[PDB]
Amino acid sequence: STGSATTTPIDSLDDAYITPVQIGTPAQTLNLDFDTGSSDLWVFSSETTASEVDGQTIYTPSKSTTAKLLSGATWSISYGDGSSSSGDVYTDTVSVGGLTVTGQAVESAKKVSSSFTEDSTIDGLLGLAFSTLNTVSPTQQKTFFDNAKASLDSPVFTADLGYHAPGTYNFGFIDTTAYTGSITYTAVSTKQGFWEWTSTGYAVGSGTFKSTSIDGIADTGTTLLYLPATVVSAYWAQVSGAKSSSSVGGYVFPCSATLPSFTFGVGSARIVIPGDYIDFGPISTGSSSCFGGIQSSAGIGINIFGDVALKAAFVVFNGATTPTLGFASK
Ligand SMILES: CCOc1cccc(C(=N)N)c1
Numbered sequence: 413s414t415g416s417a418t419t420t421p422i423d424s425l426d427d428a429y430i431t432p433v434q435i436g437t438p439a440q441t442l443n444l445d446f447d448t449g450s451s452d453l454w455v456f457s458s459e460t461t462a463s464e465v466d467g468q469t470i471y472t473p474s475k476s477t478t479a480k481l482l483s484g485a486t487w488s489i490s491y492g493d494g495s496s497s498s499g500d501v502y503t504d505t506v507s508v509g510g511l512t513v514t515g516q517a518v519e520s521a522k523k524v525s526s527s528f529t530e531d532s533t534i535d536g537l538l539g540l541a542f543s544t545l546n547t548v549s550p551t552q553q554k555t556f557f558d559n560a561k562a563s564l565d566s567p568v569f570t571a572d573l574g575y576h577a578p579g580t581y582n583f584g585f586i587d588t589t590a591y592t593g594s595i596t597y598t599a600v601s602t603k604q605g606f607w608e609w610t611s612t613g614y615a616v617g618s619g620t621f622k623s624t625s626i627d628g629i630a631d632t633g634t635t636l637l638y639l640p641a642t643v644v645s646a647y648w649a650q651v652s653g654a655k656s657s658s659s660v661g662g663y664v665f666p667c668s669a670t671l672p673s674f675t676f677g678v679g680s681a682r683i684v685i686p687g688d689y690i691d692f693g694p695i696s697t698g699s700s701s702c703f704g705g706i707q708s709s710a711g712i713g714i715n716i717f718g719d720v721a722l723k724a725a726f727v728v729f730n731g732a733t734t735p736t737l738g739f740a741s742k
Pocket residue numbers: 447448449450490491492493494631633634
């Protein structure tokens with residue numbers, strides 16, 4: 413089997429992407445944030461505290477003929493940005509892009525934090541990291557990908573995120589029309605539950621490539637590219653008037669700047685992030701200070717190849733017995 417779904421930016425800045433997901437019988441379609449840095453499939457629901465729902469589409473398990481309470485099971489997640497949610501758990505039929513899993517754990521939110529309430533466009537999360545990170549207790553649950561794997565034509569999914577435009581998540585096959593050149597594969601460590609890999613270095617603009625190992629995670633559910641302070645300083649030093657602002661919470665730069673590209677290494681291959689991908693717009697409406705898309709990972713404890721980086725590539729998440737990542741230009 414395979415599946416193929418379009419993923420769409422939630423706003424003009426590509427702050428996240430939403431992918432329609434069918435849950436239950438008859439189908440209830442919710443728009444989920446596919447997150448390769450978490451392992452929970454959770455949704456706004458008929459159980460979510462009413463004052464915490466503001467425009468989301470909710471899952472109502474009582475309207476699904478296939479919804480089964482996973483009795484006793486609870487979940488609670490805390491994300492890197494400080495946001496959170498928690499609740500109880502139903503198993504139900506879940507389909508993505510024509511690929512169906514029966515008996516998927518669907519984590520129903522009873523509570524969500526303010527960041528989630530205030531984002532009307534995201535109806536929940538679909539985690540695609542390793543199932544060792546799933547938060548369901550007392551019986552940990554599998555991701556949609558782990559449950560689908562055995563049925564897929566190939567044990568893979570691919571992320572092809574758009575730059576100010578829609579893109580695609582495919583399951584079970586690699587669309588050889590969707591990228592240019594060849595795919596370079598690199599080793600993955602699953603020790604922390606993430607798609608963790610080591611970049612071979614970086615370049616800023618037209619500058620020389622610096623060969624240096626950068627451990628980090630391929631994380632579709634993070635907007636920005638978080639790298640070591642040395643690398644980030646070297647990038648922003650090439651932008652006149654850029655500075656790190658403790659008041660704003662990262663590097664800002666004059667909106668009248670043209671940003672240099674950023675290259676990262678994947679083995680002997682190179683992925684080039686165009687400068688305009690690193691523009692995340694005025695810090696507040698009408699400001700002439702713009703927010704940077706490359707930020708320091710100092711204090712986060714891991715480097716994150718988030719959407720700024722991933723949207724410059726066709727990315728293969730190879731879930732074979734020995735997992736690997738692949739990157740191609742596009
Ligand atoms: C406290 C949450 O910490 C992280 C760290 C790394 C990834 C993610 C994620 N869900 N994409 C969340």
